[PDB]
Amino acid sequence: TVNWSVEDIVKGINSNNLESQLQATQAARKLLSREKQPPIDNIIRAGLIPKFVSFLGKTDCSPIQFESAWALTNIASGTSEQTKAVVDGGAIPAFISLLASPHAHISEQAVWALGNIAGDGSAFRDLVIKHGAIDPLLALLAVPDLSTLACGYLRNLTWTLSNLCRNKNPAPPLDAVEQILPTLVRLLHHNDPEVLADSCWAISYLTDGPNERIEMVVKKGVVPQLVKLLGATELPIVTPALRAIGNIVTGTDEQTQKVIDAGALAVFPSLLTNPKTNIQKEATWTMSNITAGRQDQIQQVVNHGLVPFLVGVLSKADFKTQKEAAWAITNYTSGGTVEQIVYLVHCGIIEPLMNLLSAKDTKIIQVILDAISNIFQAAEKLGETEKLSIMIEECGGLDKIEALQRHENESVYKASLNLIEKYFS
């Protein structure tokens, strides 16, 4: 069954000889399993999808159920239009029936296929849910100890469940999320790195929304487990764990407080110096949404020694990380006490702030000018605006602020002149 032509597959499948159909279907599976350019469109245009879908229901020929399930899985892994052709052929209810198959390799293929269909977008995700996929999927995980399940089997179930949690506009149905969450929490405590990664991705999707969505996750008590996974050595685990933590601190201050209470701030010395750029960027973004909170939360950032790390990323990092650092500083100076803002200057924030006014990015200039104003406002309540003016001048910041009076964007130049007439005049 190696390297048949599509025409040969068609004559086999049209033969109405079940065994001839099995061999042609396996031939199609092997075509669709090759690395270089699987002929997905040729298979579709040959009209084979409804035949494959019909084969999913031949319970007394389990080999042709498996071969057609595999074939349809790989078609559904193509373009949106190729996934649509699988759905258009009636595959969703047929694959859901296959979840009850006594053959583990067959139900696994059905899990995989539905994951591909749900992974196309929110419409097919919700259609898979409407056909009732969740109950049979969760039933496959109703065992006392996940460790007794096959590793590949468990990984495929976790990945498909995460695709049912994925996408916005709209987010998944509330009652579907509530139904899935207890099983997700259990997978989040499993000891397989790939299960953990996909579990964290699912939690990161569920927390990417309004505070009500975040609350649903937070009240399951997963935040301490997320913080532990924040410290993992596997980058495929840290990345979604950090994204989930970052999403949660976009919620309320009380939701942010649970992240702090769980000990997340102690991981950020590593995260803010992490060699992977996106980790540094996402860690600094998370910090910016913590320095936007209450003064007692800003104080936790101070107590954990994280201000020097913010000075560090501002001083040298990828520019997108530096922009998140600028936001973190403006949020800090906006909501912080005078004492906290003083500490920021004592840690050396002024010079790397001034250097970033050189940047070809209009909004980071806006962000930095805001922070300078907030620091000056704290300096006036101390009568120490002259000392700050000297500092800003000594490091070349005044030269840059006055150059930005010449700036194209409107409130860049207005803000830069207000600074100079109020503090440097």
Partner 1 sequence: PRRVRRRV
Judged by the rule CB under 8 A, the positions of this chain that interact with partner 1 are 32-35, 38, 70, 73-74, 76-78, 80, 83, 109, 112, 115-116, 119-121, 159, 163, 166
Cβ atoms of 121 and 167 within 8 Å: the answer is yes
Least distance to partner 1, CB of residue 364, Å: 27
Q: Which is nearer to partner 1, 119 or 136 (CB)?
A: 119
Q: HSE-up of 157 (CA within 13 Å, CB side)?
A: 29
| CA nearest to 370, candidates 414, 424, 421 | 414
Q: Which is nearer to partner 1, 156 or 374 (CB)?
A: 156
Least distance to partner 1, CB of residue 231, Å: 26
Give every CB contact of residue 64 below 8 A, 6+ residues apart in sequence: 18, 21, 22, 25, 55, 58
Least distance to partner 1, CB of residue 209, Å: 17
Q: How far apart are CA 36 and CA 254, in angstroms?
A: 51
Q: Which is nearer to partner 1, 118 or 306 (CB)?
A: 118
Q: Which is nearer to partner 1, 73 or 274 (CB)?
A: 73
| CA nearest to 369, candidates 339, 405, 334, 412 | 412
**Helices (H), ranges, 294-394:** 295-303, 307-315, 319-335, 338-346, 350-355, 362-380, 385-394
Cβ atoms of 112 and 70 within 8 Å: the answer is no
Q: Which is nearer to partner 1, 78 or 336 (CB)?
A: 78
| CA nearest to 72, candidates 18, 125, 29 | 29
Least distance to partner 1, CB of residue 120, Å: 5
Q: Which is nearer to partner 1, 70 or 327 (CB)?
A: 70
Q: Which is nearer to partner 1, 74 or 255 (CB)?
A: 74
Task: State the distance between the two ends of the chain, measured CA to CA, in whole angstroms.
Answer: 85
Question: Is the preceding omega at residue 170 within 30 degrees of 0, hence cis?
Answer: yes
Q: Which is nearer to partner 1, 95 or 159 (CB)?
A: 159
Q: Which is nearer to partner 1, 160 or 322 (CB)?
A: 160
Least distance to partner 1, CB of residue 34, Å: 8
- Cα–Cα distances (Å) from 415 to 357, 365, 383, 406, 424, in that order, read 13, 10, 21, 11, 13
Q: What is the DSSP letter of 108?
A: H
Question: What per-residue string of b and e applies to 251-264 under the rule 16 or more CB within 10 Å gives b?
Answer: beeebbbbbbebeb
Least distance to partner 1, CB of residue 77, Å: 4
Q: How far apart are CA 312 and CA 325, in angstroms?
A: 9
| CA nearest to 154, candidates 186, 127, 126 | 186
The CA R_g of the chain, rounded to the nearest whole Å, is 28
Least distance to partner 1, CB of residue 48, Å: 17
Q: How far apart are CA 46 and CA 27, in angstroms?
A: 14
Least distance to partner 1, CB of residue 163, Å: 6
Least distance to partner 1, CB of residue 174, Å: 21
Least distance to partner 1, CB of residue 283, Å: 23
Least distance to partner 1, CB of residue 190, Å: 20
Q: Which is nearer to partner 1, 163 or 322 (CB)?
A: 163
Q: Which is nearer to partner 1, 111 or 349 (CB)?
A: 111
Cβ atoms of 238 and 203 within 8 Å: the answer is no
